[PDB]
Each structure stands twice: as structure tokens, then as C-alpha cells.
Write an enzyme that holds these catalytic residues in place. Structure first.
Site, mmCIF file in Angstrom:
data_model
loop_
_atom_site.group_PDB
_atom_site.id
_atom_site.type_symbol
_atom_site.label_atom_id
_atom_site.label_comp_id
_atom_site.label_asym_id
_atom_site.label_seq_id
_atom_site.Cartn_x
_atom_site.Cartn_y
_atom_site.Cartn_z
ATOM 1 N N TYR A 162 0.844 -1.290 -0.140
ATOM 2 C CA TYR A 162 -0.109 0.151 -0.162
ATOM 3 C C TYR A 162 0.714 1.267 0.178
ATOM 4 O O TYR A 162 0.631 2.069 -0.764
ATOM 5 C CB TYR A 162 -0.960 -0.079 1.179
ATOM 6 N N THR A 171 -15.308 4.620 6.823
ATOM 7 C CA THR A 171 -15.562 3.513 5.888
ATOM 8 C C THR A 171 -15.409 2.168 6.453
ATOM 9 O O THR A 171 -14.273 1.880 6.986
ATOM 10 C CB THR A 171 -14.883 3.798 4.560
HETATM 11 N N1 LIG Z 1 -10.550 4.896 4.759
HETATM 12 C C1 LIG Z 1 -9.557 5.108 5.454
HETATM 13 O O1 LIG Z 1 -9.224 4.918 6.605
HETATM 14 C C2 LIG Z 1 -8.386 5.509 4.454
HETATM 15 C C3 LIG Z 1 -8.542 5.515 2.986
HETATM 16 N N2 LIG Z 1 -7.957 6.340 2.128
HETATM 17 C C4 LIG Z 1 -7.889 6.475 0.798
HETATM 18 O O2 LIG Z 1 -9.182 6.741 0.319
HETATM 19 C C5 LIG Z 1 -9.571 6.120 -0.970
HETATM 20 C C6 LIG Z 1 -10.549 5.134 -1.087
HETATM 21 O O3 LIG Z 1 -11.550 5.267 0.244
HETATM 22 P P1 LIG Z 1 -11.736 3.959 1.037
HETATM 23 O O4 LIG Z 1 -12.405 4.337 2.245
HETATM 24 O O5 LIG Z 1 -10.811 3.025 1.160
HETATM 25 O O6 LIG Z 1 -12.700 3.292 -0.003
HETATM 26 P P2 LIG Z 1 -13.193 1.784 -0.039
HETATM 27 O O7 LIG Z 1 -12.273 1.115 0.669
HETATM 28 O O8 LIG Z 1 -14.677 1.692 0.183
HETATM 29 O O9 LIG Z 1 -13.212 1.114 -1.473
HETATM 30 C C7 LIG Z 1 -13.024 2.316 -2.524
HETATM 31 C C8 LIG Z 1 -13.299 1.753 -3.980
HETATM 32 O O10 LIG Z 1 -12.459 0.961 -4.546
HETATM 33 C C9 LIG Z 1 -12.930 0.370 -5.662
HETATM 34 N N3 LIG Z 1 -12.040 -0.518 -6.381
HETATM 35 C C10 LIG Z 1 -11.462 -1.738 -5.896
HETATM 36 N N4 LIG Z 1 -10.627 -2.223 -6.979
HETATM 37 C C11 LIG Z 1 -10.752 -1.394 -8.249
HETATM 38 C C12 LIG Z 1 -10.356 -1.262 -9.424
HETATM 39 N N5 LIG Z 1 -9.658 -2.657 -10.042
HETATM 40 N N6 LIG Z 1 -10.939 -0.480 -10.364
HETATM 41 C C13 LIG Z 1 -11.708 0.405 -9.840
HETATM 42 N N7 LIG Z 1 -12.076 0.463 -8.471
HETATM 43 C C14 LIG Z 1 -11.822 -0.557 -7.856
HETATM 44 C C15 LIG Z 1 -14.164 -0.294 -4.957
HETATM 45 O O11 LIG Z 1 -15.426 -0.418 -6.111
HETATM 46 P P3 LIG Z 1 -15.241 -2.086 -6.739
HETATM 47 O O12 LIG Z 1 -14.454 -2.975 -5.765
HETATM 48 O O13 LIG Z 1 -17.012 -2.094 -6.938
HETATM 49 O O14 LIG Z 1 -14.525 -1.638 -8.023
HETATM 50 C C16 LIG Z 1 -14.622 1.140 -4.189
HETATM 51 O O15 LIG Z 1 -15.329 1.931 -5.217
HETATM 52 C C17 LIG Z 1 -8.071 5.417 -1.567
HETATM 53 O O16 LIG Z 1 -7.537 6.162 -2.299
HETATM 54 C C18 LIG Z 1 -7.369 5.139 -0.050
HETATM 55 O O17 LIG Z 1 -5.971 5.122 -0.707
HETATM 56 C C19 LIG Z 1 -6.790 6.998 2.823
HETATM 57 C C20 LIG Z 1 -6.373 6.923 4.209
HETATM 58 C C21 LIG Z 1 -7.202 6.180 4.847
HETATM 59 C C1 LIG Z 2 -6.670 2.430 2.590
HETATM 60 C C2 LIG Z 2 -6.506 2.619 3.951
HETATM 61 N N1 LIG Z 2 -5.337 3.627 3.970
HETATM 62 C C3 LIG Z 2 -5.052 3.861 5.421
HETATM 63 N N2 LIG Z 2 -3.747 4.735 5.253
HETATM 64 C C4 LIG Z 2 -3.093 5.044 6.234
HETATM 65 O O1 LIG Z 2 -1.875 5.442 6.316
HETATM 66 C C5 LIG Z 2 -3.836 4.580 7.622
HETATM 67 C C6 LIG Z 2 -4.225 6.031 7.968
HETATM 68 C C7 LIG Z 2 -2.731 3.729 8.806
HETATM 69 C C8 LIG Z 2 -2.304 2.418 8.257
HETATM 70 C C9 LIG Z 2 -1.816 4.614 9.159
HETATM 71 O O2 LIG Z 2 -3.670 3.579 10.088
HETATM 72 S S1 LIG Z 2 -5.184 3.494 7.112
HETATM 73 C C10 LIG Z 2 -6.107 1.241 4.340
HETATM 74 C C11 LIG Z 2 -7.180 0.021 4.639
HETATM 75 C C12 LIG Z 2 -6.931 -1.132 4.877
HETATM 76 C C13 LIG Z 2 -5.513 -1.625 4.759
HETATM 77 F F1 LIG Z 2 -5.122 -2.767 5.131
HETATM 78 C C14 LIG Z 2 -4.466 -0.705 4.601
HETATM 79 C C15 LIG Z 2 -4.673 0.597 4.318
#
Ligand SMILES: NC(=O)C1=CN([C@@H]2O[C@H](COP(=O)(O)OP(=O)(O)OC[C@H]3O[C@@H](n4cnc5c(N)ncnc54)[C@H](OP(=O)(O)O)[C@@H]3O)[C@@H](O)[C@H]2O)C=CC1
Ligand SMILES: C[C@H](NC1=NC(=O)[C@](C)(C(C)(C)O)S1)c1ccc(F)cc1
Ligand SMILES: NC(=O)C1=CN([C@@H]2O[C@H](COP(=O)(O)OP(=O)(O)OC[C@H]3O[C@@H](n4cnc5c(N)ncnc54)[C@H](OP(=O)(O)O)[C@@H]3O)[C@@H](O)[C@H]2O)C=CC1
Ligand SMILES: C[C@H](NC1=NC(=O)[C@](C)(C(C)(C)O)S1)c1ccc(F)cc1
Lengths: 259, 255
Positions: B157, B194
Site C-alpha cells: 500500500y 468507511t
Molecule cells: N478509509 C481510510 O481510513 C483511508 C482511505 N484512504 C484513501 O481513500 C481512498 C478510497 O477510500 P476507501 O475508504 O478506502 O474506499 P473503499 O475501501 O470503500 O473502496 C473504494 C473503491 O475501490 C474500488 N475498487 C477496487 N478495485 C478497483 C479497481 N480495479 N478499479 C476501480 N475501482 C476499484 C471499489 O469498488 P469496486 O470494488 O466495486 O470496483 C470502491 O469504490 C483510497 O485512495 C485510499 O487509498 C486513505 C487513508 C485512509
Molecule cells: C486505505 C487505507 N489507508 C490508510 N492509510 C494509512 O496510512 C492509515 C491511516 C494507517 C495504516 C496509518 O492507519 S489507514 C487502508 C485500509 C486497509 C489496509 F489494510 C491498509 C490501508
């Protein structure tokens, strides 16, 4: 705890991209330091020529295994046969890189991918392979990197993106190993402008800047890798070595080491 | 920042089926803008589109497809664009499904993280730029803490996330020099609400999660305000430490 050239005397060290530039330099130092070394690149006699030079300098072994780091499987069995040759691995020195020049990014995703494959992705493949051996020897890993791998810099996008990748990856792996009791060292080297034939031709008359010595850079990367140092900084600018260090990150990481 | 900027704007939103991607979609909708969300799950993309096509969006469409496929991403902006006769904001936010685990030999996931998480972002950009230069538009790359600092269990990641940084932060510079009036906002997010993350850090990580809702909005604001970077995270320590002064200084020194 001072470094001793005598420290690297029986160590079976691999060095990628040792065909020329830094790579080659590390190959000689390690060679003169009497130790089993394996250089890899993609150059028939270019390698055949450094191996010879190594043995003479005072090696203790010297081979070579040609192959492009684009073929993950080459790196796959490369480590394999390089190991079924020295008998285990004591310190991998990933350092090779897909050749790159100064250009503004437009649509060269092929080159973006190449870098992100050769410069990074292959480094994992090489590690995965060498790990077992390394774990068993308590080996050290040395991922040579650049300032561009620590700071944003124009004209080297695909390049910088890969070196940044190595930080995000190896530093994280370093942490997992930490808590995972694995006693395998991992050194990261952020280099400044080094006087290689490559840089001093891919930047001469273009991206204005002064370079540092080549050999002085190679051994430095060495004392660093050997001493099991976390990261190594080497640039001819004082004020750079001064700034390139980000303690905010060190703290945030520490603070987060308890969660 | 005034919401009277987004109204009538053509915005794409990768990863918009669930999570932060989805919420951003709704805001862009309630704010009366044009949205084209994507992801893989058709069924899910249907449900948000209508929901958007009722929250106030001036247009809302979806286009399923895997970002692991490069010609798809490539063909995605073209259609997404024609659907709304032009593009304003490009919001890369989708990540390949992962989880917490030490690293071992799954280079398949390592190779895919840098494909879905990173490589596709460049693809999406190179093809969306023309239209972006066509309206002094913006680009919004969503990253995270792990993308600024090294953290265990997410090596893959993090690698991809650091790549985004090195790349776009590097491209942005090339831009301000190339008379390319297109902005690039890197979002560094902490732990977000999320389930597709919360359910993955179940009892493994400790940090009160922030809300999707707010996080989602903040990002949009930052991109609208053409801010180089958006720093959102519940914890106070982070917002301070996460910033990098030395890099700022070390960089201002070349320009
Ligand atoms: N939630 C958190 O704590 C954190 C999230 N982020 C960032 O936020 C962003 C996403 O938010 P997050 O809450 O994790 O959202 P989700 O974990 O809920 O997933 C986001 C999306 O990824 C899509 N996805 C998976 N595989 C593919 C693919 N091959 N092509 C297109 N879409 C794909 C899923 O739809 P589907 O599988 O139907 O395609 C879904 O819309 C990321 O960039 C993450 O890096 C950053 C820090 C923390
Ligand atoms: C997509 C989401 N992004 C995060 N990014 C970070 O740096 C956080 C805040 C940390 C790791 C530090 O808690 S969590 C994530 C969700 C599941 C997973 F297995 C690895 C990453
Ligand atoms: N020189 C500088 O100013 C700076 C260098 N660095 C770092 O230094 C390290 C090495 O740079 P440097 O020695 O100066 O550069 P060089 O270009 O002089 O050396 C490149 C080496 O890479 C090998 N190589 C290239 N492509 C491949 C491939 N597909 N498979 C296997 N080997 C390959 C070459 O052999 P061949 O192509 O014939 O196979 C050669 O021995 C890198 O980690 C780099 O990022 C960092 C900052 C500055
Ligand atoms: C191999 C060398 N690595 C460098 N990385 C950096 O950070 C330095 C010191 C810079 C000057 C780019 O600031 S030079 C390189 C040389 C030319 C090229 F097109 C890409 C990379």
C-alpha cells in the site's frame, strides 16, 4: 562501533547494476576488501571485465550473471544461481536502474512502467528471493536511492516515483521485520549528484548542478550497509545533508510505534 | 471556497461505488455538478448514480471496469468526457482491495498495488489532461499517512502511495514551468470511517476514525481551492508532524 574494511572479508555480497558507475565502484571496493561478490547487469564482456579487475584487486571470488531486470523471472533464478554459487547470501546490494534522461512528462507511460518495474518491482523480486538466505545469515540489504526519492524534482517524474516507492516499501518492511524478530538489516541511501558517466551526460549543460566523487560514494554506501545503518546520506552539499533529514517523520513514526 | 464553483462542473470520481469515493460523489451532486463515477461493481454504480441523480447532480453516469486494465482507464475519460461534453475535475481515489499483513512472497499484490493504485492514475491523467488544459481544471490524487510515513502491515500500500507523491509532486513542478494551468492536489488522509478499512483494522490498529462525510468534503474543497495538498485526520499530533518543512525548504531552494 567503528567500521572496519576488515569487516567485509568473508561476506558473500551480491551487487546489481555493477556493470558501471556506482555499481562497479562498490564491486571494486568489496573486491579489494577480499570477499565473494557477484555482479549482475546486461553486458557480456562489460561484466567479464570487472570480474577480472575484481579478482586482481584482491577479491576472494567474482562472477557475473547477465540478464535484464525487466524479466522478473531472471531476478527470480538469478538470486537462485548466484546463491547456488557462493553458498548463501550475506548482503544484497540492489542498485541497478533502467536508463533515464531529463524530460517533461507527456505520455511515456511505457517508460513510467519500465521504471516502476525495473527500478522498484524488481527490487522486491530480488529481495523475496534473497531473503531466506539473508534471514539465515542475518544479512543486510542496501537499496541505493536518490534525493529525488526524498524530494520532488522536475524532469524526473517516473524516476522519482520509483525511488519514493522504495522508501515507502523498504521502510515499512523494515518495521515489520523489526517486530517480527527477523534480524536482517535494511539500509537506504539517498544520494546527491554523483559524477557518473551516466549522470554527467544526462544532465551536463542541462539541469545545472555540481557533482560529488564516484568512489567516495560507493564505499560510503558500503560502510553504511555494513554497519547495519538505517539510511545513508551522501551529497557534496553541506546544507543538503542538513535539510534532507526529516525528524518530523521520525517522531510521527515513533509516536505511532505504539498502536 | 464557495460551492458556486462546483455547480455545473464536470467531475470524474474513480472508486465511487462505496467508501470515500462514493460520498464525494454525493457532495458533487448536492452541489449541483456533473458527475461520472466508476469502479467495478455495476450494481453498486447504479445505486449511487440515481441517488446522485436526485441529490441535485446536473448529470450522473457510471462506467464499470477494472483499473487493472489499462486501455479501460484510457477509454474511460473519453466516454466520461463525451457524456458531459468536457472535464473539469479528475479525482483519482480508487485502490486495489488489500488488508493488514506482514509481507512475504505475494509480489502479485505488490505488482498489482503499483498497477491499480499507481500506474492507473498516470493512465487516467495522461488521457484526461487535454480536457483539463481545456478549462484550467484540476487533478486530485488521494493518498494517505502510509503514503508519507512508513507503517508495517501495508508495505505494498505504502509503496504505491509514495509513488503517487514522487510522481505528481514532481509533475506539478514541471507544470508550473510548462505554462500548464492544471492543478494537482495530493490528499494525505488519516484513518477514515468507511467499513472497507474500518473492518480491516478491527482490533489491529488504534485510532478514532474520522467521518467519511467530512473527509470527503474537505478533499473536494482542497481541489477546488487548487491547494497543493489536503491534510485531514482526527488526531492533532499528525496534522502538525505530518507536514514536512525541510522538504518545502529543500525544494524552494531549487526554484
Ligand atoms: N478509509 C481510510 O481510513 C483511508 C482511505 N484512504 C484513501 O481513500 C481512498 C478510497 O477510500 P476507501 O475508504 O478506502 O474506499 P473503499 O475501501 O470503500 O473502496 C473504494 C473503491 O475501490 C474500488 N475498487 C477496487 N478495485 C478497483 C479497481 N480495479 N478499479 C476501480 N475501482 C476499484 C471499489 O469498488 P469496486 O470494488 O466495486 O470496483 C470502491 O469504490 C483510497 O485512495 C485510499 O487509498 C486513505 C487513508 C485512509
Ligand atoms: C486505505 C487505507 N489507508 C490508510 N492509510 C494509512 O496510512 C492509515 C491511516 C494507517 C495504516 C496509518 O492507519 S489507514 C487502508 C485500509 C486497509 C489496509 F489494510 C491498509 C490501508
Ligand atoms: N549518478 C547519480 O548522479 C545518482 C545516482 N543515484 C543512484 O545510483 C544508483 C546507480 O546509479 P549509477 O551507477 O550512477 O548509474 P549508471 O547508469 O552508471 O549504472 C547503471 C547500471 O545499471 C545497469 N542496468 C541498466 N539497466 C539494467 C537492466 N535492465 N538489468 C540489469 N542491470 C541494468 C547497467 O548495466 P547495463 O545497462 O549495461 O545492463 C549499469 O551497470 C541507482 O540506484 C541510482 O538511482 C542516485 C542519485 C544520483
Ligand atoms: C541516476 C540519477 N539520479 C538522480 N536523482 C536525484 O535526485 C539527482 C541528484 C537530481 C539531479 C535529479 O536531483 S540525480 C539521474 C540522472 C538523470 C536522470 F534523468 C534521472 C536520474
Amino acid at each position: 562501533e567503528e567500521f572496519r574494511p576488515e569487516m567485509l572479508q568473508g561476506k558473500k555480497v551480491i551487487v546489481t547494476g555493477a556493470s558501471k558507475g556506482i555499481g562497479r565502484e562498490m564491486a571494486y571496493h568489496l573486491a579489494k576488501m577480499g570477499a565473494h561478490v557477484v555482479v549482475t547487469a546486461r553486458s557480456k564482456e562489460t561484466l567479464q571485465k570487472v570480474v577480472s579487475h575484481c579478482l586482481e584487486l584482491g577479491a576472494a571470488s567474482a562472477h557475473y550473471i547477465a540478464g535484464t531486470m525487466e524479466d522478473m523471472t531472471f531476478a527470480e533464478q538469478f538470486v537462485a544461481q548466484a546463491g547456488k554459487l557462493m553458498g548463501g547470501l550475506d548482503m544484497l546490494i540492489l542498485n541497478h536502474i533502467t536508463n533515464t534522461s531529463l524530460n517533461l512528462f507527456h505520455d511515456d507511460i511505457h517508460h513510467v512502467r519500465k521504471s516502476m518495474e525495473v527500478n522498484f518491482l524488481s527490487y522486491v523480486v530480488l529481495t523475496v528471493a534473497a531473503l531466506p538466505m539473508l534471514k539465515q545469515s542475518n544479512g543486510s540489504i542496501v537499496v541505493v536511492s536518490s534525493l529525488a526519492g526524498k524530494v520532488a524534482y522536475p524532469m524526473v517524474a517516473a524516476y522519482s516515483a520509483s525511488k519514493f516507492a522504495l522508501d515507502g516499501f523498504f521502510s515499512s518492511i523494515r518495521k515489520e521485520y523489526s517486530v517480527s524478530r527477523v534480524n536482517v538489516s535494511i539500509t537506504l541511501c539517498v544520494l546527491g549528484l554523483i559524477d557518473t558517466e551516466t549522470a554527467m551526460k544526462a544532465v551536463s549543460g542541462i539541469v545545472h548542478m555540481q557533482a560529488a566523487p564516484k568512489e567516495e560514494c560507493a564505499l560510503e554506501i558500503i560502510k553504511g550497509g555494513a554497519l547495519r545503518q538505517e539510511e545513508v546520506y551522501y551529497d557534496s552539499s553541506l546544507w543538503t545533508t542538513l535539510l534532507i533529514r526529516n525528524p518530523s517523520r521520525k517522531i510521527l513514526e515513533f509516536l505511532y510505534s505504539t498502536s
